[PDB]
Design a protein around this motif. Sequence first.
Motif, PDB file in Angstrom:
ATOM      1  N   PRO A 222       0.553  -1.259   0.011  1.00  0.00           N
ATOM      2  CA  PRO A 222      -0.063   0.297  -0.305  1.00  0.00           C
ATOM      3  C   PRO A 222       1.155   1.283  -0.451  1.00  0.00           C
ATOM      4  O   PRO A 222       2.076   1.379   0.444  1.00  0.00           O
ATOM      5  CB  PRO A 222      -0.900  -0.306   1.140  1.00  0.00           C
ATOM      6  N   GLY A 223       0.336   2.212  -0.678  1.00  0.00           N
ATOM      7  CA  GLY A 223       0.981   3.738  -1.064  1.00  0.00           C
ATOM      8  C   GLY A 223       1.767   3.218  -2.195  1.00  0.00           C
ATOM      9  O   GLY A 223       2.562   4.822  -2.504  1.00  0.00           O
ATOM     10  N   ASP A 224       2.691   1.698  -2.861  1.00  0.00           N
ATOM     11  CA  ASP A 224       3.774   2.332  -3.894  1.00  0.00           C
ATOM     12  C   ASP A 224       2.820   2.900  -5.079  1.00  0.00           C
ATOM     13  O   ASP A 224       1.724   2.590  -5.412  1.00  0.00           O
ATOM     14  CB  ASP A 224       3.883   0.981  -4.025  1.00  0.00           C
ATOM     15  N   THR A 225       3.558   3.504  -5.544  1.00  0.00           N
ATOM     16  CA  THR A 225       2.532   3.908  -7.122  1.00  0.00           C
ATOM     17  C   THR A 225       2.672   2.887  -8.832  1.00  0.00           C
ATOM     18  O   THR A 225       4.230   2.430  -8.295  1.00  0.00           O
ATOM     19  CB  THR A 225       4.111   5.330  -7.712  1.00  0.00           C
ATOM     20  N   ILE A 226       1.805   2.672  -8.896  1.00  0.00           N
ATOM     21  CA  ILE A 226       1.343   1.606  -9.912  1.00  0.00           C
ATOM     22  C   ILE A 226       2.531   2.653 -11.145  1.00  0.00           C
ATOM     23  O   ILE A 226       1.936   3.106 -11.695  1.00  0.00           O
ATOM     24  CB  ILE A 226       0.495   1.152 -10.313  1.00  0.00           C
ATOM     25  N   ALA A 227       3.475   1.853 -11.615  1.00  0.00           N
ATOM     26  CA  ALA A 227       4.304   2.736 -12.534  1.00  0.00           C
ATOM     27  C   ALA A 227       3.715   1.866 -14.275  1.00  0.00           C
ATOM     28  O   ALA A 227       3.982   2.467 -15.556  1.00  0.00           O
ATOM     29  CB  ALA A 227       5.879   2.338 -12.589  1.00  0.00           C
ATOM     30  N   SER A 228       3.705   0.520 -13.693  1.00  0.00           N
ATOM     31  CA  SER A 228       3.108  -0.407 -15.050  1.00  0.00           C
ATOM     32  C   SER A 228       2.318  -1.494 -14.381  1.00  0.00           C
ATOM     33  O   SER A 228       2.101  -1.965 -13.701  1.00  0.00           O
ATOM     34  CB  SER A 228       4.215  -0.618 -16.209  1.00  0.00           C
ATOM     35  N   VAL A 229       1.215  -1.836 -16.001  1.00  0.00           N
ATOM     36  CA  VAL A 229       0.500  -3.335 -15.390  1.00  0.00           C
ATOM     37  C   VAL A 229       0.816  -3.840 -16.650  1.00  0.00           C
ATOM     38  O   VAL A 229       0.463  -3.592 -17.730  1.00  0.00           O
ATOM     39  CB  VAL A 229      -0.607  -2.840 -15.251  1.00  0.00           C
ATOM     40  N   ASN A 230       1.935  -4.962 -16.853  1.00  0.00           N
ATOM     41  CA  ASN A 230       1.614  -6.232 -17.662  1.00  0.00           C
ATOM     42  C   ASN A 230       2.260  -5.441 -18.773  1.00  0.00           C
ATOM     43  O   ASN A 230       1.766  -5.386 -20.213  1.00  0.00           O
ATOM     44  CB  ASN A 230       0.313  -6.897 -18.645  1.00  0.00           C
ATOM     45  N   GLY A 231       2.937  -4.794 -18.949  1.00  0.00           N
ATOM     46  CA  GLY A 231       4.323  -3.759 -19.688  1.00  0.00           C
ATOM     47  C   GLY A 231       3.799  -2.609 -20.163  1.00  0.00           C
ATOM     48  O   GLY A 231       4.050  -2.425 -21.163  1.00  0.00           O
TER      49      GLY A 231
END
Lengths: 90, 88
Positions: free
Chosen positions: B49-58
């Motif tokens: 929790p709190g981590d920024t999502i940079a990418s999803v499945n590339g």
Amino acid sequence: SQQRKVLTLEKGDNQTFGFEIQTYGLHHVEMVTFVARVHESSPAQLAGLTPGDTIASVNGLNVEGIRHREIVDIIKASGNVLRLETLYGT
Amino acid sequence: SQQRKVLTLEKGDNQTFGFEIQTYGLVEMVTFVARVHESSPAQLAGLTPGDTIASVNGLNVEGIRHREIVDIIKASGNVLRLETLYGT
């Protein structure tokens, strides 16, 4: 459009306000404090504190450049009445 | 100092990964991990929790909103690949 909300939480002596906050460094890094949890039937819920919203100020203090511990410390030092300003998170 | 972490989540057919995302306006819109359930595939994979999502499945999710990202996650099936940045 106003995403700024002012709230007042009131509780009893040996009670807690019923909410949890988490401060995150979001990557553009920006420190943002979020309401992570608000307990059902709690003073926070009654005051209308919404999970997901961000804390803008506590008892008149802009939380801008201050540590997460400072915020928790301020909340604990507030006693039975707490004044908060939040911004729409969702 | 490497802020970027790559994760792989895996679940069963009739279940979810066990996490919620939140899109927040700061560049502009950024999506982070709002919540991760106890005992979930997401927790097991190390999602925090709190981590920024940079990418999803590339896919870089920079200029994408909540629902479109959730759609991508749903389309992913039982395996999901994520790249996140430290929020704590």
